[PDB]
Design a protein around this ligand. Structure first.
Ligand SMILES: O=C(O)CCC(=O)c1ccc(=O)[nH]c1
Ligand SMILES: O=C(O)CCC(=O)c1ccc(=O)[nH]c1
Lengths: 206, 200
């Protein structure tokens, strides 16, 4: 059910898709390559299963948080939607091994070959991103699709980068500023994205 | 040298630092490994030279655009500074390879990435933060500094050259041009910085 996947996850996170071998994953899992192949077919499908498992929980949480929003008596807005989308990528219990590996794996996604990345994002990222765009468009004052759609692209870029867990803010401020917590990071991303979407909207026409 | 660098650039862009071999780069360049070693020392130093060359021209152009800004009788603002920082990454083969190489930077080992960004990205980013702080209405360092981090995330992603907007809109929306991309990033970042400021 799970042990091979966990090991595969670790090896992919460390070496990427190309550098990972089924040899190594079989060794680390104490099984044969043939058994891994039996269950998962190709290295590419194993990689997809690792992403399927990780993103299934994340998207389930996004859906729960979005449902919560829709049950609020006093309504919700763009800020809330963005937060909802971001939270499940950054919240964990602070130990959080399972979290780390999949965070690191996603943070490397841009370096994976397009042959695996294209079908991956088509199956596992696109639908939920389109739904997020759609939800934002249903808000009051939101009737510029370009602004929201570009906003979504830039949001993704921020997610992948922050998933690295590098203290970039600290590096750039000589240690004077740091993220306080995962929630501070989510908060700052949310505000930044919400404002950016507004400015894209505002800049089209007057 | 110039030829070896170009080949090294291509191989690093395709395979990353770890997966790249001096063997392959020597083959593609029609020289021996020993000769590459002679000129560049280690694979790590070769990698750094590829980045030094690429970022030297980029930063030189940033500096020229910033000087232009400071000579304008009517002054300049945050929007102008951000644009100035972004444009040389997106205004152009030579272009493609370095763009792709930078877009993979997050997957490189920290042993090479740490000294790399220290030597080649940090100083100019701090200078960009500083220039924005010198503008009217800008006296929130956190907002600008977070803005700069998010700007970097956007740059690396857009340097992939993937039509993500097209993928997500069933082909209904696309980047018109490199300038349209720069424009949209600039507006987004400028507004985001404002919102961070406004929220504190
Ligand atoms: O843009 C990509 O290449 C795929 C990544 C993506 O669409 C994504 C990644 C994380 C996330 O939370 N939402 C979308
Ligand atoms: O954030 C990183 O890991 C290093 C990249 C970086 O600091 C950077 C990249 C492109 C650019 O234009 N300015 C900074």
């Amino acid at each position: 059910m799970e042990l091979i996947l966990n090991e595969a996850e670790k090896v992919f996170a460390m070496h990427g898709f190309l550098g990972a071998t089924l040899k190594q994953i079989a060794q680390n899992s104490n099984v044969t390559q043939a058994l891994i192949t039996y269950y998962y077919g190709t290295k590419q499908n194993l990689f997809m299963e690792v992403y399927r498992r990780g993103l299934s929980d994340i998207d389930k949480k996004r859906q729960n948080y979005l449902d919560e929003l829709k049950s609020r008596p006093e309504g919700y807005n763009t800020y809330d939607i963005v937060r909802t989308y971001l939270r499940p990528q950054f919240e964990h219990r602070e130990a959080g091994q399972a979290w780390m590996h999949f965070a690191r794996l996603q943070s490397r996604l841009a370096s994976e070959p397009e042959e695996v990345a294209v079908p991956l994002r088509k199956e596992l990222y696109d639908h939920t991103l389109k739904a997020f765009i759609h939800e934002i468009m249903e808000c009051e004052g939101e009737d510029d699709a370009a602004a929201v759609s570009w906003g979504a692209v830039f949001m993704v870029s921020m997610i992948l980068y922050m998933l690295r867990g590098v203290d970039r803010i600290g590096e750039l401020t000589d240690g004077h500023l740091h993220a306080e917590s995962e929630d501070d990071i989510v908060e700052r991303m949310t505000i930044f994205i919400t404002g950016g979407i507004n400015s894209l909207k505002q800049a089209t026409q007057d």
